[PDB]
C-alpha cells in the first residue's frame, strides 16, 4: 500500500459525467482500504498540442494511497475507457495533501 | 537550427563523435 | 529487498532478543529468506544477469557463515539447518 498520484484527462464532450467517473474510481479506493488524500478537478484546459483533433481536455488530478492490485484495476479500465484519452499514474514517496499550483 | 542539420545530414560513427567530444573538453582548458 | 516487518519477525524468532541482530543464526535466516523469495523472481526473469550477481553473493555469503558456525559449534549448526531445511 503506497501513495500514487494519478492524472487523467477526459474527452471534452463527455465532461458532464466526470463526477460520475470520480465516484466509481474512488469507490474502488475506499473498498480496498485505501485513503484518497486529495483530489482537484481542473475542468477543461487548453492542450499544448492537439491530440485526436481535440484542443481542450477535462483534466482531473487525483492523489491516492492504495495497494498495487487496486491501482492495476484502475489503470486497466483507463485503457478500456473511451472517455479518457490520456492517463498518468505516478508513485510518490510520501502522501501530500496540499493545493496544486494549478489551483 | 542550421547547426543541427550539419550534424544529422550524414551518419557519424559513435566512436568518432566520442573522440571529438573529448578533444573539445580538453580544448576548453586554457 | 526484504521487508522491515519480515526482517523484524525473523530477528525475533531466531535471535535471542530484539536488539540481537548480528548473530550467525539470524544472518543465515535472513539470507535464506531473501534467497528463497528471489527464486520466484529469477524463474520469471532469466535475462536479469545483473541481479543474479547479487543473488550469488547471498548464496556465497550464506555458505561462509554456515561453515563458520559448523566449525565453531556443530550442535547449534545442525539445529539451525534442520530448522531452516538446508543442506
Amino acid at each position: 500500500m503506497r501513495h500514487y498520484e494519478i492524472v487523467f484527462m477526459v474527452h471534452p464532450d463527455q465532461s458532464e459525467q466526470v463526477p460520475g467517473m470520480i465516484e466509481r474510481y474512488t469507490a474502488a479506493i475506499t473498498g480496498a482500504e485505501g485513503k484518497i488524500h486529495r483530489l482537484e478537478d481542473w475542468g477543461r484546459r487548453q492542450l499544448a498540442y492537439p491530440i485526436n483533433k481535440l484542443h481542450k481536455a477535462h483534466y482531473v488530478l487525483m492523489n491516492v494511497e492504495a495497494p498495487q492490485e487496486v491501482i492495476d484495476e484502475l489503470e486497466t479500465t483507463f485503457r478500456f475507457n473511451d472517455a479518457v484519452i490520456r492517463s498518468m499514474v505516478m508513485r510518490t514517496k510520501h502522501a501530500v495533501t496540499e493545493a496544486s499550483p494549478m489551483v | 537550427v542550421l547547426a543541427e542539420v550539419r550534424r544529422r545530414e550524414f551518419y557519424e560513427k559513435p566512436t568518432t563523435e566520442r573522440k571529438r567530444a573529448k578533444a573539445s573538453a580538453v580544448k576548453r582548458h586554457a | 529487498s526484504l521487508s522491515t516487518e519480515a526482517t523484524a519477525k525473523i530477528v525475533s524468532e531466531f535471535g535471542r532478543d530484539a536488539n540481537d541482530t548480528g548473530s550467525t543464526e539470524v544472518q543465515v535466516a535472513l539470507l535464506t529468506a531473501q534467497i528463497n523469495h528471489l527464486q520466484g523472481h529469477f524463474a520469471e526473469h532469466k535475462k536479469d544477469h545483473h541481479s543474479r550477481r547479487g543473488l550469488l553473493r547471498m548464496v556465497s555469503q550464506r555458505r561462509k557463515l554456515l561453515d563458520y558456525l559448523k566449525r565453531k559449534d556443530v550442535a547449534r549448526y545442525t539445529q539451525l539447518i534442520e530448522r531452516l531445511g538446508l543442506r
Binding site: 484527462m9 499544448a48 498540442y49 492537439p50 491530440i51 483534466y59 490520456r86 496544486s100 499550483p101 494549478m102 | - | -
Partner: protein
C-alpha cells in the same frame, strides 16, 4: 522538490521553441537540473507544455 504541475515555473526554464535551457545558462544546481528536466518531460506528456513550436 520541483513540481511538474507548476507550468509557470517550468516555462522559465524552456526556450520559445520549447527546448530545455542548459544548466550553464541559468546556473541552477546539478540535482535540480535533473529534477527540472524530468518534470518538464512529464509536463510535455500531459500536454501542459509543447515539445516544439511546430505542432
Amino acid at each position: 522538490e520541483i513540481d511538474y504541475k507548476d507550468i509557470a515555473t517550468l516555462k522559465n526554464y524552456i526556450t520559445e521553441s520549447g527546448k530545455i535551457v542548459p544548466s550553464r545558462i541559468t546556473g541552477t544546481r546539478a540535482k535540480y537540473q535533473r529534477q527540472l528536466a524530468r518534470a518538464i518531460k512529464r509536463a510535455r506528456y500531459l500536454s501542459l507544455l509543447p515539445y516544439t513550436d511546430r505542432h
